[PDB]
Amino acid sequence: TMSVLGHYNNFFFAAHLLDIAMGFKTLRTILSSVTHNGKQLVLTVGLLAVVVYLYTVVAFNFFRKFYNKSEDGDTPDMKCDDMLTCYMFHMYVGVRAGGGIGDEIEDPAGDEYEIYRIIFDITFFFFVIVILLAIIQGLIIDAFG
Amino acid sequence: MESHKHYTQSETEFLLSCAETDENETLDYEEFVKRFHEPAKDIGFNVAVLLTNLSEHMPNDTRLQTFLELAESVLNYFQPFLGRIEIMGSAKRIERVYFEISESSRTQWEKPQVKESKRQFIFDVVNEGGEKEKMELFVNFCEDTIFEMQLAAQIFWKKIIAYQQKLLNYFARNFYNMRMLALFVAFAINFILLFYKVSVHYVLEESSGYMEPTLRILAILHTIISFFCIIGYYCLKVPLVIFKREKEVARKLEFDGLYITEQPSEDDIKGQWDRLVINTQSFPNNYWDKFVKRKVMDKYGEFYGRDRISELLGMDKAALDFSDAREKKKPKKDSSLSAVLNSIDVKYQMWKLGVVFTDNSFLYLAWYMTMSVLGHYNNFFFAAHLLDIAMGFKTLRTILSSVTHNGKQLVLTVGLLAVVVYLYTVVAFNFFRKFYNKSEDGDTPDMKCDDMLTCYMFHMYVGVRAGGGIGDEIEDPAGDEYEIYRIIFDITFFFFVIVILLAIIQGLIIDAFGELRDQQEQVKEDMETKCFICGIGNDYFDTVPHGFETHTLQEHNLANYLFFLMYLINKDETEHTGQESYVWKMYQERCWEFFPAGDCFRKQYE
Amino acid sequence: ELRDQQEQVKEDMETKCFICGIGNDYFDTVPHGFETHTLQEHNLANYL
Ligand SMILES: [Ca+2]
Ligand SMILES: [Zn+2]
Ligand SMILES: [Zn+2]
């Protein structure tokens, strides 16, 4: 079927490069590993989404004035003036930022919510970055092993 | 009856000879089986256990082989009714005792909560408990489980009480379904909350009607469901925990004399809360042993003062109540006419409240209800109910237990991290304070190092999460006045704080998760490839086909042992056999040498 | 490795005798057998 579709759009022949993953032994092992801990991986990703949603609701409630992803504007591109937009922004940026979420939004630098915002950023970087993402990576690598 | 392939013509005519012919050619099969089946069933069970004993003792006899083919033809009916136990006592040899298992007992064992109690006991007895107290914990589990089975089987004044009892029973029976419904409605209301927006002025803007009132509907429904959940729990699982605690304190009073000769410490709040009602009126309300008071009185009365014992144990000035009840006792007594309420004991009620408010699960349900109530004020508090999946699933519970497991080590490692960050903070505040200018145009310099606490917070907040030390976010030296020292500072920070201590914390948590998972799968492997009672092994029974599975399902079944204990309890003693009376005496004296420790019937005989 | 050595030392002190080192299963026949064996018969404090 992929060959027939490649006859229509020639770029569909790239899906045939995954044939080595089935022809070799260690690549089959990698695929079987990413499939092995299926339920555990799905549940860990669910817990990740749940904790990111909790951080999302607390940021949408309290720290909604820090999510101004603009440099000159002057129209503010507020990523927190919408619950779904803020949740997608969190799940898409704060998980892959490698340093939590406080490293891509503006710093507090003001003694009105500074300590709470610092606690927020540190707890995000701890639970979401160096625990849950590490737990998913460990699940997959331990399945491979 | 002649065409159902289970009767011959002689048997059909013999059974038709038992007809009634009630002047209309009609027999009542209901009364027929109600009259002609029960004693037949009893005596057939007796002869069946006799034939089974003869079989399992003397094998390979052709006359006994014909007797055994007839026996098994009978046994195809009595298979789920007879249980066998392998006792070791009174003869220094393994003895296979046989007994009856009730269909009601089988149903209460198949009941859901009993299975959860069984799996929890297996887990916490293979993980924490070893082999010295393994049989003690197993007997305690058997007692708690037969109490739970009794409770599950149990699940103007004659118009409201009879309805509130049925309501409470319905809640206790549908407690788990109520939990699933609460989780579903929490997911629904949280999806609706995800569909939100803002204008200072919150508004569910991403929808066009049909979504604003359903939020309030689901909120009030979730609150009602949480209330029903806690109400069902308080009458489904609270009896079991209060029964366990009553049994513990009563046996501590009887055997060890915890509050007579060996008064507990000052830090054990459990001891004080039990001393609170060691002297209440209805002390053994669920332990089904309403004579522990008299037992401990007779045990510790002639040494520490019978009057003092009767005073500190409740039931004051009634040291002759036993004789008064033995000689011309009162027949009965009406409840009251002027006292319709307050008949219960406030001391025992306060004790029950104090023991249920520390159950660690009733506390979770109370937190659930409180979060629902707070969500009624601010709807965003319903997001805290999404953490219910973390307790409902197994691997998420494992993750939480992992982040809690290495508590002291994690706290001390975080403390060492804070200490080394404070050392770097003081050295930077002293020497390299001119590099912490977090400004691009200014011209007002935003010096993050002109204050010790500000510099420490800046370090702990930026240099730990920067992933490349601290030198990658402050200005580079580029000047041969402090360049080498600043480079050493940055490199040592990136080494000690980033690639050692943070890695050590992450490793602590991930290793706790791995250890918990490995303990779980080790418990599973031990339950699959090792016997619970004897623990001889798997290879010994891996000789005949399905050997170990039949050994664990027929000979050494934990359900069979529990049913045997229940049978001994409901056996109406003075009718016990030799083995049954021996096991009952051992159970009464709390010895438990009748369990096969390192031997079995197959290892004893051929 | 350091943590594992520490917990191995602890496990050896808990499930093995210091003087003789016969084992734990041998004394795990009577109740509290190994504990009484290490607290009464082969006590290091007693030897000192
Ligand atoms: Ca008798
Ligand atoms: Zn066995
Ligand atoms: Zn020794």
> Chain A interface, mutation test: which of B458, B461, B494, most A Cβ atoms within 10 Å?
B461
Chain C residues with beta carbon closer than 8 angstroms to that of B597:
29
Alpha-carbon span B125 to B131, nearest angstrom:
9
Distance separating alpha carbons of residues B330 and B486, to the nearest angstrom = 94
Given a contact cutoff of 8 angstroms between Cβ atoms, the answer to whether B532 and B558 are in contact is: yes
* Residue appearing with tokens 């109400």: B231
What is the Cα–Cα distance from B306 to C45, expressed in whole angstroms?
A: 43
Cα B551 to Cα B180: distance, rounded to the nearest angstrom: 37
Contacts of B383 in chain A (CB under 8 A): 53-54, 57
Task: Say which ligand is closest to the CA of C37.
Answer: 3
At A88, is the secondary structure helix, strand, or coil?
Answer: helix
Could B197 and A125 be called an inter-chain contact, meaning their C-beta atoms sit closer than 8 Å?
no
**Taking the alpha carbons of B530, B535, B541, B547 in that order, is the dihedral positive or negative?**
negative
Per-residue b or e along B506-528, where b marks 16 or more CB atoms closer than 10 Å to that residue's CB: bebbbbbbbebbeebeebeeeee
> Alpha helix (H) ranges present in B58-94?
62-78
Cβ proximity of B96 and B84 under 8 Å: yes
Inter-chain touch B198–A57, beta carbons under 8 Å = no
CA-CA distances (angstroms) from residue B383 to B180, B228, B237, B396, B399?
16, 20, 27, 17, 20
What are the chain A neighbours of B393 within 8 Å (beta carbons)? 43
What residues of chain B lie within 8 A of the CB of A59, using their CB? none
User: Which residue in the block uniquely carries the two structure tokens 């204050």?
Assistant: B451
CA B472 to chain centre: 52
Closest CA relative to residue B579, chosen from B590, B138, B571: B571
- Written as six digits, the tokens of B157 are 């004044």
Structure tokens at B327: 């000689």
Amino acid at B493: F
The Cα–Cα gap between B373 and A126 comes to 30
**In sequence order, which residues have a C-beta less than 8 Å from that of residue A62 and are 6 or more positions away?**
A113, A116
- For residue B87, give the H/E element and its range: strand B82-88
Rounded-to-integer distance, Cα A134 and Cα A118, Å: 22
B with C: touching (≥3 Cβ pairs within 8 Å):
yes
Extract the tokens encoding B286.
Answer: 């669920």
Residue B465 CA to residue B502 CA, distance in Å, equals 9
Angle at B429 between CA B423 and CA B435, to 5 degrees: 120
- What's the rounded Cα separation, in Å, for the pair B273 and B341? 26
Which of B407, B397, B392 lies closest to B516 in space, CA to CA? B397
- Judged by a CB distance cut-off of 8 A, whether residue C31 touches chain B is yes
Q: Which of B495, B491, B490, B502 is nearest to B436 (CA)?
A: B490
Task: Tell me how many degrees the CA angle A105-A107-A111 measures, rounded to the nearest 5.
Answer: 140
φ/ψ of residue B198, rounded to 5: -135, 155
Distance (Å, whole) CA A49 – CA A94: 12
CB contacts, 8 Å: B132 with chain C: 28, 31-32
> How close B404 gets to chain A, by Cα (Å)?
13
Q: Which ligand is nearest to the CA of B535?
A: 2
* B553 C-alpha to ligand 2 centroid (Å): 10
Cα B387 from Cα B399, distance rounded (Å) = 12
Tell me how far apart the alpha carbons of residues B251 and B268 are, in angstroms, rounded to a whole number.
17
- The three-state DSSP-derived secondary structure of B277-344 is CCCCCCCCCCCCCCCHHHHHHHHHHHHHCHHHHHHHCCCCCCCCHHHHHHCCCCCCCCCCCCCCCCCC
Contacts of B410 (CB under 8 A, 6+ apart): B505, B508, B509
Q: State this model's resolution in angstroms.
A: 3.5
Q: In DSSP terms, which residues pair with B87 in a beta bridge? A: B95
Task: Please spell the DSSP secondary structure of B479-490, one letter per residue.
Answer: STTTHHHHHHHH
Chain B touches chain A, with at least 3 Cβ pairs below 8 Å, answer: yes
Distance CA B597, CA B131 (A): 10
The residues facing B84 across adjacent strands are B98
Which long-range contacts (C-beta less than 8 Å, at least 24 apart) are formed by B112-121? B112/B176, B113/B148, B113/B152, B113/B236, B113/B237, B114/B145, B114/B148, B114/B149, B114/B152, B117/B141, B117/B144, B117/B145, B117/B148, B117/B240, B118/B145, B118/B558
- The 10 Å Cβ neighbour count of residue B118 is 17
DSSP string, B16-44: HTT----SSS---HHHHHHHHSHHHHHHH
Which ligand does the CA of C47 lie closest to? Answer: 3
Best mutation target, B190, B394, B395, to test chain A (most A CBs within 10 A)? B395
Partnered with residue B85 across adjacent β-strands are B97
Provide the β-strand partners of residue B83. B99
Q: Quote the radius of gyration of chain A (alpha carbons, Å).
A: 21
Distance CA B15, CA B10 (A): 9
Which of A47, A53, A117 to mutate to test binding with chain B, by most B CBs within 10 Å of its CB? Answer: A47
Technique employed here was cryo-EM
Measure the CA–CA gap between B502 and C25, rounded to whole angstroms. Answer: 42
User: Token digits for B272?
Assistant: 């004080």
Chain C nearest-CA residue for B132: C31
Torsion of CA B32, B36, B41, B44, to 10 degrees: -140
Contact B192, B211 (CB under 8 A): yes
User: How many whole angstroms from its chain centre is CA B529?
Assistant: 24
Give the helix ranges, DSSP H, for chain C: 2-14, 33-36, 44-47
Residues 388-447 of B with CB under 8 A from A: 389-390, 393, 395-396, 399, 403, 446
Cβ–Cβ below 8 Å for A81 and B461: no
Among B149, B163, B67, CA closest to B112: B149
Chains contacting chain A through 3 or more C-beta pairs under 8 A: B
**Ligand 1 center to B581 CA (angstroms):** 9
Measured CA to CA, the distance from residue B596 to residue B121 in angstroms comes to: 20
